[PDB]
Amino acid sequence: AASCVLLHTGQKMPLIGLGTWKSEPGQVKAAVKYALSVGYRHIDCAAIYGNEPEIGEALKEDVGPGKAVPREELFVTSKLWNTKHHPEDVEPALRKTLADLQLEYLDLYLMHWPYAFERGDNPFPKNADGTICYDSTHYKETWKALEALVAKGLVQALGLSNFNSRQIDDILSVASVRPAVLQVECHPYLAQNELIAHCQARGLEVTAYSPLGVLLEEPVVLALAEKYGRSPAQILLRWQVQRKVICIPKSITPSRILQNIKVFDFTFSPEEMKQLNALNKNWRYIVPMLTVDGKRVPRDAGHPLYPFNDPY
């Protein structure tokens, strides 16, 4: 169904992929198989979603040897969690993911966040006040460890997730392996225009998460929906897709799963792209918060390697 982009690896990555972000372990498999049937060849995963094994079983039923879809035809992404930033922990964390997903290698491996959580197995090390027990590993450090992975042949490409421009450059100045993708929150309210351009200048492809960012209730998006016989969500995805931005919409409902991939047989005119382009408000929803005295406060703003303090 989807068309792809070409990564600096030489790898083709479809523009649409299934997000497993909040997929229940129980509902997930059914989702994987359906999407597989419908034309999907890209699945975005994460050890923190805590559903890899379920995903691994679904895959086990359709990919490979005498199966429906051949491994070589699927693009699988995963991510290193915060508590696994120690150079010594990188490899085993990946191997754990590979076991769970039951794969011999990953296509894209991202570093989930630039900053780390206290070294260990509990994914959310907290103090009794609900505050996070951080760690000081520098991402350049974890980065070098990730490189050993591509060399060993456990992953084909490395990526960054939630990294600012400065961050990207920092890693680049030390890298042997250039990061292929940059995964961030992107939608019409958070267009990420400076960052996409930066990524462009640097040789990174951009993958948008939370593409439907009420964004769905915008007259402009409702007009296009009516104009193209499409849903408000397909419009949002078309904008990104057309913009050459890879989207990973997460869903566990067949009807939406189908719709989500069907954004290639139509195109917006320039006045329309402008229309959508006019919605920007530097509006991020995906920010770790904390409730103190009945007020939501940014949760990791004090961390040295925190990404959202810089303008982009």
UniProtKB/Swiss-Prot annotation:
One GO biological process term: lipid metabolic process
N-acetylalanine modifications at: A1
Effect after changing R299A: Abolished S-nitrosoglutathione reductase activity without affecting ability to reduce S-nitroso-CoA
Effect ascribed to mutating Y49A: Abolished reductase activity
GO cellular component terms listed in the entry, alphabetical order: apical plasma membrane; cytosol; extracellular exosome; extracellular space; synapse
Effect of E54D: Reduced activity towards daunorubicin
Residues where N6-succinyllysine is found: K126, K144
Binding-site list for NADP(+): 10-21, 44, 161-162, 210, 212, 250-253, 256, 259-260
Active-site residue numbers: Y49 (proton donor)
Site label Lowers pKa of active site Tyr, positions: K79
Compartment list: Cytoplasm, Cytosol; Apical cell membrane
GO molecular function: aldo-keto reductase (NADPH) activity; aldose reductase (NADPH) activity; allyl-alcohol dehydrogenase activity; glucuronolactone reductase activity; glycerol dehydrogenase (NADP+) activity; L-glucuronate reductase activity; methylglyoxal reductase (NADPH) (acetol producing) activity; S-nitrosoglutathione reductase (NADH) activity
Chain positions found as N6-acetyllysine: K126
Record PTM Phosphoserine, positions in chain: S3, S37, S210
Resulting phenotype, K126A: Abolished S-nitroso-CoA reductase activity without affecting ability to reduce S-nitrosoglutathione, glyceraldehyde or glucuronate
Result, substituting I286A: No change in enzymatic activity
Function, in words: Catalyzes the NADPH-dependent reduction of a wide variety of carbonyl-containing compounds to their corresponding alcohols. Displays enzymatic activity towards endogenous metabolites such as aromatic and aliphatic aldehydes, ketones, monosaccharides and bile acids, with a preference for negatively charged substrates, such as glucuronate and succinic semialdehyde. Functions as a detoxifiying enzyme by reducing a range of toxic aldehydes. Reduces methylglyoxal and 3-deoxyglucosone, which are present at elevated levels under hyperglycemic conditions and are cytotoxic.
Record's protein name: Aldo-keto reductase family 1 member A1
Species per Swiss-Prot/TrEMBL record: Homo sapiens (Human)
Gene field: AKR1A1
